[model samples]
Target: MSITRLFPALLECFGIVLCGYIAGRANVITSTQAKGLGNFVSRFALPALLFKNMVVLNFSNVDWSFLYSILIAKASVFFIVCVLTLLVASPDSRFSKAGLFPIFATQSNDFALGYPIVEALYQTTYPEYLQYIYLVAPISLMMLNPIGFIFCEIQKWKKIKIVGLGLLRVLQNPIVFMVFIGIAFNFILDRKVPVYVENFLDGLGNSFSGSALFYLGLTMVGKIKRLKKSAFVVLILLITAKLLVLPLLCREMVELLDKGDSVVNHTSLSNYAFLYGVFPVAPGVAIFATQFNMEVEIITSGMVISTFVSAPIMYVSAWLLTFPTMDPKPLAYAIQNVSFDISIVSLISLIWSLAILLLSKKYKQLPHMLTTNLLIAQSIVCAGMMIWNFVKEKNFVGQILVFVLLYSSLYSTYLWTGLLAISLFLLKKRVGIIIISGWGIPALLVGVLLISAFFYGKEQMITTAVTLFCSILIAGISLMCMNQLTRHVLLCLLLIIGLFANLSSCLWWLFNLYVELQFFCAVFNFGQGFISFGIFGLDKH
Candidate 1:
């Protein structure tokens, strides 16, 4: 969970997503084309793939007490999230979140990311214990999905008749039917899914994670440019609950439930606890919103944003979740450093933005929201600086550190800086900003984006976004009121950078994968650690 291991796996997962986003932007795929892909995977491909996952559980080894514990944990987490969300957003809030959080917090992308990761890490080393994870999948599916879908539907349609029909429709869905059929296949029939059928299912299911995530990325890019700052608070809460709280609950449950004479495998059960801790909003959640004609933008936007926060936590949780079997201490140590990294980097990003604007100080009276802009900038800078000093005083920074390094820590702090720049800039009085370049629009925009990738080698969120926006915004100050070509360049950078900012940390995962090499121990490769660090004052101090 140093993120060294986590990055490689995630790059493989999200790279496909990025491709979809690029295709959408380039018009290689029409919206209808993308939408159809989503529908295909949700109904046909996922059920087959997920059904095999369910079948792998081999229910004959069931324990009533362990079963009850999982159900309780799911319900407990769901209930807590709902109550806190109510206070956070209340009803009549956006995105049908009453549905989103209950499901998002409880359900996970186990079939997509988790199961494959478990296999990668353990199939050779702990093959005997892999089924424990297979068992964990269905547990999450059963405990969260049905009930969470109920909330998901109820929020979208208030009528009981409509909700009832939705429930029946959900039951009729292939994914739902497969879950039931899988249960019967393993439990009542006391049989495993046939080998040929399992292979066919997996072969078909391979498309689900890729296609599902593709549409997710495809849906996100256009809307991201217009992203709202008000949604920032809600994203923080969701990440905290999913990444931090759920794992903490698992740790406590290990202490409480793994008592003497228990039937549970402690390591297996412990890993299962952190299972949901790694996913973004469930892969299917956006598709669900799309099918129902509800708000998909907020759902997509929330997923894209929370991803910045979730990356480092998922990195840590990836290893810590398997604690008691693997050494948990190293992950805890890495997370401590990453957490310090997030606090300080967030402050640095804000100060740089403020200094850039103040240093320029040549603005004509631009907007109606003048005081609002200054207050927002000054307020966030002061508040974030307080947090920065707290981390600095802890001596987390070494003298060798020249300036901030921008890999994801617990959260992507630069998202705020990106927000800081975006929120302030939008106050302009409907000024015209447009760019028309041959291929240069896409190519150069992508070029500035790759500069962020230079900082991206370590995979932090803030520096890339901070650098990308700061570079563009600083360049834009005078040029914007000047001419067409330069104006479009800046405007192009804004839209392109907006797309890049949404993907900052995720892109860095690929960047790290590109440059990182395996250094076995001195004798047997002195522990598999990545010594990839840069200084530009790109300090990983």
Candidate 2:
């Protein structure tokens, strides 16, 4: 298959399998390992990739007018989404999970998956389209990240704190910081980055395709079966907004902006704005939802489902609106690409959904086989990829692959293992153990496999081996201690730790963006460490 056709399908398949596997393996995986991996990916890998990519782009070529319009539309959509969610959501309803559904539905996953799709589509159709993405990146992050998080918190607390720590958290996200920094670097330097650095950035950018998408899939496997009708309806509406309404409104808005007498450069800006509207919903919404104690299952389910359902509509709309009179050949090619992507995504979603549904019915008899399969496959693939990269001496791809695999393995392991321990102590039944363990053990195995891969070719195998060994040791100790805790303490500690970890991570990223890195490091690291200690140190005795 051609690059245009093959790229998206590959990404979709990879994302689903990877995410499903990790989520399935959650029980046996250790908390320390998961947090370590999570920190590495969010704090280090993703930021590094974004910084590298941002430093190279030529900002001077960016169309200011078009950029402003994109910002306005994005901000406008966010406001509209928040208002709509509030109006529709029941005041007496469960704010904990239900409130989060709307936010997840409305936000766009522009950076993680959208960037690659945009690059591929634009490269084939409009080569100049890459510049628009550079402009869109900052606007999307600045407006969406803070606003989305605030909306979730407001729903939970029924009060909005525009000042104080809330505002600080909003302003400090690493993604937002990176965008601003990238822009400043671009403008101040007044030139493109060196070729070597650009190449390095490009290589890092490639990691996102496999790692990010895979995590998304693993998340779905854990959540898809629980999707309610209300959640489904909300997801459909959100997808409609993202794929259809957003793009159409953006086109009209761009046209109106261009109608001014002085408007000269219309094509690029207008085209970019239109494309921005059609991009898929942001995955950050789900990320933020988890942070705010929102319904993560619903959020993840919506993301997985919407991706497949929205594909054809977005592709057809883009073609009809952007290139009305274009030749049949390009249109045909676009259609095929759209169909291929949609088919792959739909197949994966169906398989994942069915697996969850079937397992839910016979849940007592079987371990979480689906989740186990996913984790094991993911672990093997990650390890294999690392080995392939090592043998070939492709250091960049190898390093990124290793980072993605290891981080995912760690996170999945910690989450599942924690859940399994809770299930065993709270329920005191084989079925509950089976249900939780199904997810946990695979996560643990994957974590182990990832650690093994990390040390495979290293001369300092002892050091690498020790790091891996410590992860398992910490997790095992934590689980044993967790079993001793009273049910009440376990419940409270889980809530507190999960909430604190997510919030701290968000705040840490945000603070680093706006204030001094040292301050952010001091506050978040200490806060998170304290939270972890409280969680692990709690005892029933």
Candidate 3:
């Protein structure tokens, strides 16, 4: 699950970081060139991105309660970090370092990294949840950032008349400046910015993620050449505060404040808030670290390490916070239509997979075999779904039997995909053991459930409970399967998409969210055969 969740961040942010790191390591770019690139991103790309998102937000839709919860949470962390630093740090660098810790602890990589991860997790169910990512940036930028800036300003001049001048400097900051301007224009235009204007901003803003991430990687080049053991104490402390401390407080505040709000899913909001907390310290923190020339190594190291750690943090949080299974809803027209459509697609995909098996002599290879089995499992699931949809006339035993077949097939798709992930690093001749485990485990789980069903009166709730239990197990294994392989890009892609398809399908059965998401989950789950054939069957290898 974390591998799937982490995949987006790796592709989106970490990939760019790799490019920058390689450039620096190989001397493809000089320090001056790297700094220039950073300037371009911070000055133009990021500001435009902020302006673009800020302009489109509707005042009417603003959830004051939600905003307050996040604000209070962030504010709490900011002060906590500040007080701790003032109390603990050495005398010479004390004043300068005082301001930076709070901002580092509170700020998050909301746009570049957090956006993709949040969208991946919730876009299928609660898409409106994404706006919260945008909402989060301004709070840190407007509130926490200025305080840090002022502290640095005071340290710079070593004078008392710093307040007004520091405020002016903060306002003059391009990123912060653009935020206020955008918000002002949003109100002035009544959230009715022209299409051409937004298009222009979109073009500029689109560059922010790559440019900012590349710059971050550039900064990381020589700065992180090595870390001394004693230096690591600060690094560990900083990371703990950002990734652990801030998020815990945020989750607590969300739970406390969002209680009794029936109009929205407060539980989900709390989860989202917790996710926001776990996002790595923004690259902007490193940018600020450079500006102040204080604790550069600690800041950059903390940013990079925190990002790597956040995937598991998010995955574990989901497991801990998942809601209990809900009773299945009555089938609607949308569900029937989606089921039939997906079935046809899956049939075509099955035929494609068979063709691959026949045409490719390399089908004997473990990867090829595993991929074929996954497609076959998907085909069975598709067939099961079609039968269940059309042949609704069934006795109790027959209906249960149909579901048992469906459950077994669905579990294989998950298990085989997981087996393939594990197969990547396993011994060359370990085929038999994998084959047994891959095909037999689903049957084993089904057999146990069937015995339970026979002994206890088979009820709909038991079906839900049994399926939910199996879903978590399959998902848990698949989620942990994030750790390598040949043709790994496509293989991991298939694994992640297949995991989400099956997991979402089961969740849709239990706690149905939006109708479109239900159809989407069904289409992807049943249509996996098509996707698998494309990824595996059509491959040259």
Candidate 4:
């Protein structure tokens, strides 16, 4: 009757599509409703869940060495994938399916689908599972947003303006910021979160299961028609690489690294390695791909197909590899308990996807219906919940909430802002007007929230203050340069300065804080001084 073990099997059995449809049919939901529901789960629920889990999970027991090995292995695999994509996957080859697919193939959806299953499997069976999730999840997320997006942007290098614009877009993402802040909070604060706040986060975290799968289902159904022969072949290769080959590679790496000798109990390293490598591709890949202009159809389709194809193999492989009795009781028991919730969600997604697909075919207006009304409504509802949380808390907790809100808000805003900025500077005011009106308010709101968090929070007040000061100062300089010089020249200078300053300050702060408290204070103060000077000095430019 253990709920955690039973959940994943239930998710697999029902599938997300059925759940979406049921939600739709009972007069309880529409496509718009489903979208909203999915958004709420993602933007608010999942993040809160992560915060809560992270706060409570016992980190003291973690083997830093084992964790490091896992990280190295993951990075190695990622590097290998990149090399293969660039070198082996011929760009001119039809199999390349544009430059984007290679990037998509290299990254996996480990965040959304993989993490949940890992959590459920390990939560009860192995109390240390959360630590594994904590270790691998962030790495997966970091790769998806920054590294993956960079590769995608690189692929479109032929278009100078687009390439330049994409770089700006990548630098401005909120999710990247969130991850940075989250890591800071975790390492710097190094304190336990309050019970009430933790509980709230736990509640919010529950949204990942239903919402993620539901979205996956909907996307899969929508993209099913786009699944050409080449696409299908690529998907198959991706599946092979992700599910079967990755684990095998990981196993060999573990052996090569002599991880078995490193652990106290011989089984620990192998078990950890097996679990780490074998988990299905993280869901963040799909989310990241969608966020960037990489084809969502390929990403989503890969996600769904991978989930169905990989689940059994992964589960069985983990079981056999971890516990070789061939007894499926543990897996079965795990699935049975969590099945109801999983069934409910999976069913919803399946039905929603089917309905939308059918409607798209029937009405020829379905894509418009979904893209405009449903997607927008979903994003708003999800965003609103986080905003409400931020407004309600108005404390350190509020800062975290606002931080998350800003991070989610940034990507959408960046798209419009970049477009509008380009349009305006290029003398294309017609497009500029549309971009500004559509994205401007949200951009402003995100900017305000980010500024507020970096300025108002008590946890790392000095550090935040310095960061903010520098940000503003740099903005002023960039603005002045824009007026004095050509926009292109100003932009280049601004980007270079911004990237170097932000990256340097962030890295310096993080490293100094970890290694030497006194060093942190010195660097923080220095950063603040420079930031202040930059802000005021550049204001008149």
Report lDDT per candidate.
0.47, 0.49, 0.66, 0.46
TM-scores for every candidate against the unseen true structure = 0.56, 0.53, 0.57, 0.51
| Residue lDDT tens for model 3, 211-271 | 7777767776655424666566777777777788888887788888875456347767777
Point out where model 2 deviates above 4 Å: 1-40, 92-106, 152-161, 192-203, 259-275, 319-323, 328-541
Candidate 4, 1-541: lDDT as tens digits: 1233534543553356445534454445654555676677656766665665555555687756555655556666566666666776656432223334433443454555656666666556555745666655565445433454455555645256654554555445333444455556666657466667766665666666667666555544333334666666667676666666666665566566654453434454555566566555544556655665465666667765565545535543544443332235554332222222322332333334335434545213322222222223223323433354336447676666545553334323223223323333343222335434444544444455456222433333343334334434444443443341133233323333533444455455545522122222222222221222211111212
Candidate 3: the clashing residue pairs are 1-479
RMSD of each: 13.9, 19.7, 10.9, 26.7
TM-score-better candidate, 1 vs 3: 3
Model 3, runs deviating above 4 Å: 1-11, 154-160, 225-230, 318-320, 323-541
Best by lDDT: 3
**Candidate 2 lDDT, 415-509, residue by residue in tens:** 44344444433444435464445345534443454452223333222222333333334434445564522432333344334434433443444
Model 4's alpha-carbon lDDT is 0.46
- Once model 2 is optimally superposed onto the true structure by TM-score, how far is the C-alpha of residue 458 displaced, in angstroms? 69
Error of 1 at 129 (Å): 6.1
